[PDB]
Symmetry: C3
Subunit: 148 residues, 3 copies
């Protein structure tokens, strides 16, 4: 099976990520993740913190996953693109998820909290089976760094 594990880092993110074990019944390939804070995107590159730690497992083994823009991220009011096309995250990374978002416009752009700009897709485009939202400071073995 293919399972995702998301743990909020800040207490602000915990309001959007309450603990549960969602079964992905409707076969949605992507896992939407929230902007847990209001943010102003200046023209050019922006580093957007997602306030979450993510691990994805395939066949009982930790695997990589992809960060992809949602159709909602780019509109006529805000020309936003992911800087690196799609973000690849290796299974060894156990830190906070960060986005590189380019504001192609010439004026600052405001994004509001609860807005989902990106989605997480597992390596090989495997549809997830469960999406576990772990509580804030649960010590999870998949989030322990393992220098190779």
């Amino acid at each position: 099976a293919t399972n995702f594990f998301i743990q909020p880092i800040t207490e602000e993110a915990e309001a959007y990520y309450p603990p549960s074990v969602i079964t992905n019944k409707r076969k949605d390939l992507g896992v939407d993740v929230y902007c847990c804070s209001d943010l102003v995107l200046q023209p050019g590159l922006n580093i957007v913190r997602l306030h979450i730690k993510v691990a994805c497992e395939h066949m009982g083994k930790k695997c990589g996953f992809k960060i992809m823009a949602r159709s909602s991220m780019c509109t006529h009011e805000r020309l936003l693109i992911l800087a690196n096309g799609i973000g690849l995250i290796d299974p060894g990374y156990v830190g906070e998820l960060m986005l590189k978002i380019i504001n192609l416009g010439d004026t600052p752009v405001q994004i509001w909290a609860k807005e989902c700009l990106v989605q997480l897709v597992a390596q090989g485009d495997h549809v997830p089976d469960h999406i576990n939202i772990l509580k804030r400071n649960q010590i999870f073995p998949l989030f322990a760094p393992t220098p190779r």
Copy 2:
């Protein structure tokens, strides 16, 4: 096996999509789709209609597919990019395919009909086996909406 199903919506698109069952002998991963109309791309975001309905099947089950730019889309004469890197389409969608194309230049850009700017790639990068072009108003069960 992996099979694609394309049905033109307009009669203008039918000239470019005549009915047949192509066997993908040459293992081409992508399925080119035409701009069935001349269009002017203003600077910034553009919504480009593709005048087709698409379904993709893997192992007898409906799956998702990806919209990806072709190497031909961006040239020195026209700075065009897909707005969301690559477009993900869930298997439940049975509507017309739409592109979000960003014109990064400062002057309008003209695209002519028959030009193929994007290609369709199945979930998991599975090379297709057949590419079925269904006639305009054939009622196909894979194009019937099924609210989940």
Copy 3:
């Protein structure tokens, strides 16, 4: 298994690609490739030659692979993006690898040799097992063109 094969074309690229058979022990999905020459990226589209020939094999059969930007390519000092989101290369191509890189800034950008801007990922996001660096003018059967 999944194996990559890289052969430098120029003698300048050979300094960065010395011959060996690396076993991908640390399960890195991507294969970093170097800019083997200093280059100036003008605003707009740039054609960047990588001075390498690449073949990727999956289950003893030649397959396609994807060119993806690294997190290092886009920074606050240089707004660079791959023009076509991610580059798809069909298994039939046996020529030199070329990048379409868009400089979104208004002033030229300098990239230095040994800098890795992109990475190669196999079709289906299969983690490689070996990364073979073939010497400059070894005649390899996977690099012989086979018109289909």
